[PDB]
Design a protein around this ligand. Structure first.
Ligand code: CL
Length: 146
């Protein structure tokens, strides 16, 4: 291989205390309601709700805001807010995020345990998926944990 991979490391604490220059990621629905969970913090901090809606992204895609020189990734993992995501759509969204990272100079990415709270996925599976998606990159990933 030609890459060092994600080299996931874990930090106990609030995601929003991570470096302001890191790009961030979390999961939402096509509705872009962001009414519960960590999504409400992304909504309140970064805004841009209509700018997200205007991107008209679908399940398995990623919507993106540029905020202070870095990117905020909204992984569109399901159609409606009340639905649960499939692992297949999560993987697609992650791949789309990776593609954007590589097209836009992202080297340092932070995220919570995506999919594994309100969306009821298991971190055993999600963690392995993130690792595989980012294996052939040199994007360093940090996961913030509670
Ligand atoms: Cl949503």
């Amino acid at each position: 291989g030609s890459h060092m991979g994600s080299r996931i490391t874990y930090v106990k604490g609030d995601l929003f205390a991570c470096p302001k220059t890191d790009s961030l990621a979390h999961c939402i629905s096509e509705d872009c309601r962001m009414g519960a969970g960590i999504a409400v913090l992304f909504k309140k901090k970064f805004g841009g709700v209509q700018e997200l809606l205007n991107q008209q992204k679908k399940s398995g895609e990623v919507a993106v805001l540029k905020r202070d020189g870095r990117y905020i990734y909204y992984l569109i993992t399901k159609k409606r807010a009340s639905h649960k995501p499939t692992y297949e759509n999560l993987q697609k969204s992650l791949e789309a995020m990776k593609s954007h990272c590589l097209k836009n100079g992202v080297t340092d990415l932070s995220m919570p345990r995506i999919g594994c709270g309100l969306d009821r996925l298991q971190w055993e599976n999600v963690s392995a998926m993130i690792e595989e998606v980012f294996e052939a990159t040199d994007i360093k990933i940090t996961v913030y944990t509670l």
